[PDB]
């Protein structure tokens, strides 16, 4: 009864950051040191906990959030950060207890003509609350005039495309990101380590 971390990290296709995918993990045992000592992850940063202690800890639930961004935006997936990804796509709480794992996926998520299947939100009136999700595509109204659902002056499409190319720089290459949140409620902790 191993925790199904394999189908989260080794998934064939990944979600867009504006429509990030959440998977709940419970009722299983998980070996976190194998995570920290495999796949040569580019970034592996834990807040409020350490992987060695995580291997001897128990939690009520574990949420794994998966998406794809560019490398230069990976630092936005962290508590107290600002920017397009942090503000309008995926926001972490200031009290975030959990880990953030990111690895380069140029060989998977890049195409010679440009991979435009990955989108990020560029326009939003207010910053997202922590763990809030917005997959709406309503035309952003920048002026006082109504937009009526058509692109035009003061009427922008909210989403923008990365257009990943293999020849791009590392900071502009596709990185796959998995965020592990550890929820500990007043319930029996069903997901633990060895």
């Amino acid at each position: 009864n191993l925790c199904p971390f394999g189908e989260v990290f080794n998934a064939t296709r990944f979600a867009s950051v504006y429509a990030w995918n959440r998977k709940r993990i419970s009722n299983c045992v998980a070996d976190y040191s194998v995570l920290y000592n495999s796949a040569s992850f580019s970034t592996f940063k834990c807040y409020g906990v350490s992987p060695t202690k995580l291997n001897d800890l128990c939690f009520t639930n574990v949420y794994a959030d998966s998406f794809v961004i560019r490398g230069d935006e990976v630092r936005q997936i962290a508590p107290g950060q600002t920017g397009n990804i942090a503000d309008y796509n995926y926001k972490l709480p200031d009290d975030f207890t959990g880990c953030v794992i990111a690895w380069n996926s140029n060989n998977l998520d890049s195409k010679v003509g440009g991979n435009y299947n990955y989108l990020y939100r560029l326009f939003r009136k207010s910053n997202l609350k922590p763990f809030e999700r917005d997959i709406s595509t309503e035309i952003y109204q920048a002026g006082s005039t109504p937009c009526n659902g058509v692109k035009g002056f003061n009427c922008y499409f909210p989403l923008q495309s990365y257009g990943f190319q293999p020849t791009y720089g590392v900071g502009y290459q596709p990185y796959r990101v998995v965020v592990l949140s550890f929820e500990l409620l007043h319930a029996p902790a069903t997901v633990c380590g060895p």
Partner: antibody
Amino acid sequence: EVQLVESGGGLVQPGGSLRLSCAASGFTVSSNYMNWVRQAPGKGLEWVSVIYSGGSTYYADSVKGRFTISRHNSKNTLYLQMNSLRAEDTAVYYCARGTAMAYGMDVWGQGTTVTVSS
Amino acid sequence: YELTQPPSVSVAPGQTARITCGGNNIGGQSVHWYQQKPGQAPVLVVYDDSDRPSGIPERFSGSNSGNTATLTISRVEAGDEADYYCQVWDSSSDHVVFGGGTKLTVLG
């Protein structure tokens, strides 16, 4: 009717303070990317600051810790407070709308001059 | 981050002028070209590397190849004499980076 009108520039002694105002017509400042961009006399354009629609702010290294971008929705006006001024800040300051990530900066102000000299 | 532009480009009236902009990550970035006539404020003449803003003459075209962005002005008239700047948003330093500026002078 789509215009940006700047004001508040002038002569300031080194180490002084000065506030620049940019009144907008034709779009809403609070829901737009708004930039302050300066240009020293004879030199090229230098980006100074940007404010996001959600409130996040970014500043250039040259003005970090001294300048502050802000907005007032009641007057639909962008503001740039500038403290601890030095001679190198002597420039014409424009306000503009847009983000360099997409669609660029389309509407620009006429610019106001700021001279820091004793 | 640095955007590299030739300081000067000179072209006779009616000929075609090309202004280049080089950067390490320009291929992944959206390049915007602005024109500033002497004494006036900058005006946006190219956005998203190839898109013409409303009101800009069709002779102003944006091109992107590899890590070089080229602003091409066809059938150059004397009124186009101005300083042209390429601009991107660099996410390696969270900055809006401007090119050095190119002085397009129509040869008379």
